[PDB]
């Protein structure tokens, strides 16, 4: 149904292989989500900024049915589409109050995997 939420938060889980955009409220209750791999982009096209904005635009219009006009952008992770997905949120009806990078940074914690000997 219509939750009638006016203030939201947009999360872009941009990675080197896929970009997941999720629109949520100020308390972290998700409403709509879309991914680059879920928009017909598979393989080499899933890791392209154009696929990222298609995911952001697809989830963008699915989020207006809640009557959402204000949101804060929480982009996280590296990859081709950290910014291209945010520019998609501007094309559809929205105003961005703030843009924040929430990419997790270990303070030299858990050991990462080994170098790929490609």
């Amino acid at each position: 149904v219509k939750k009638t939420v006016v203030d939201g938060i947009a999360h872009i889980h941009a990675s080197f292989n896929n970009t997941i955009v999720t629109i949520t409220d100020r308390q972290g209750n998700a409403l709509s989500w879309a991914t680059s791999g879920g928009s017909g982009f598979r393989g080499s096209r899933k890791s392209t900024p154009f696929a990222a904005q298609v995911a952001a635009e697809r989830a963008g219009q699915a989020a207006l049915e809640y009557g959402l006009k204000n949101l804060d952008v929480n982009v996280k992770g590296p990859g081709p589409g950290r910014e291209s997905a945010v520019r998609a949120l501007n094309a559809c009806g929205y105003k961005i109050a703030s843009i924040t990078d929430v990419t997790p940074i270990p303070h030299n914690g858990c050991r990462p995997p080994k170098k790929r000997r490609v």
């Binding site: 590296p78 105003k95 843009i99 924040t100 990078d101 929430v102 940074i105 990462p112 080994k114």
Partner: protein, 55 residues
């Protein structure tokens, strides 16, 4: 890594300030370095070359 959009400016220049904040913090470089584990020999060998280039 955090910018606030002000009144009466285009959202385009809000983006350019955003990544300018990002490279100032250097978050992309940090996540690139933590992608895989660099052994202490490879890390010390990289820093030794960094000192040579600087001088």
């Amino acid at each position: 890594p955090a910018v606030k959009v002000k009144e009466n400016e285009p959202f385009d220049v809000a983006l350019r300030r955003f990544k300018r904040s990002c490279e100032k913090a250097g978050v992309l470089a940090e996540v690139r370095s933590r992608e895989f584990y660099e052994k202490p020999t490879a890390e010390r060998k990289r820093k030794a070359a960094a000192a040579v280039k600087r001088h």
